[PDB]
């Protein structure tokens, strides 16, 4: 859709859409920027992620409302509308997964970009798994697991334990274990080990890096408190 707009203009419009909380626009602008075929900078990867996370986050919240009504009710309208929302959500996830596969991931060679995209891939398969109920639910779950696992393996080899993307990846993989894979003990173990190894590395950091890392460590702690 965005083929006639300059890459830099798409990026500037994505930033403006973020300021205006127009996340559907911002996702469309960032999709156009990706389709320009150049690799994304650190800032641009964040813009891409923020846009689609907000879009699918609203879809997930609407799906949960409608699923809650549908389970309480158990005419066809509630099922039909939950299905419509569900199809829209799957379409957004498929779009993001298609961008990662064509061709963000294969061109991402530095640890920071490759772990970022693979965490994205695990997340959007996780959102697919949240609504999956048919023949391929197991394959969807394994696709999320495999993406997260590769990202974990890279982040442990290449990143310090306080690196924000390493922390937030481990956070989301722990949520995957707890909510999707029915493995709460793995979820708890991962959140504990992630927190403790980051805590032991905090002394190496500047004031601003310390703030970035401890913020995500708080989220790990919140989950541990909820789960134990």
């Amino acid at each position: 859709a965005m083929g006639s707009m300059e890459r830099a203009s798409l990026i500037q419009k994505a930033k403006l859409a973020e300021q205006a909380e127009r996340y559907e626009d911002m996702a469309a602008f960032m999709k156009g920027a990706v389709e320009k075929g150049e690799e994304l900078s650190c800032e641009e990867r964040n813009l891409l992620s923020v846009a689609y996370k907000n879009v699918v986050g609203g879809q997930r919240a609407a799906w949960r409302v409608l699923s809650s009504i549908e389970q309480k009710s158990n005419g066809p309208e509630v099922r039909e509308y939950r299905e419509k929302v569900e199809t829209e959500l799957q379409g957004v996830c498929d779009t993001v997964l298609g961008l990662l596969d064509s061709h963000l991931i294969k061109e991402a060679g530095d640890a920071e970009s490759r772990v970022f995209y693979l965490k994205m891939k695990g997340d959007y398969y996780r959102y697919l798994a949240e609504v999956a109920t048919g023949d391929d639910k197991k394959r969807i779950i394994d696709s999320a697991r495999s993406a997260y696992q590769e990202a974990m393996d890279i982040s442990k080899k290449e990143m310090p334990p306080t690196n924000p993307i390493r922390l937030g990846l481990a956070l989301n993989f722990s949520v995957f274990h707890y909510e999707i894979a029915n493995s709460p003990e793995e979820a708890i173990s991962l959140a504990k080990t992630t927190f403790d190894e980051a805590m032991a590395d905090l002394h190496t950091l500047s004031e601003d890096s310390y703030k970035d890392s401890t913020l995500i460590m708080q989220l790990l702690r919140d989950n541990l408190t909820l789960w134990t």
């Binding site: 923020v50 956070l171 989301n172 707890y178 919140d222």
Partner: peptide
């Protein structure tokens, strides 16, 4: 629900 990563 548990917290996944968010800004």
């Amino acid at each position: 629900r548990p917290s996944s990563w968010r800004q």
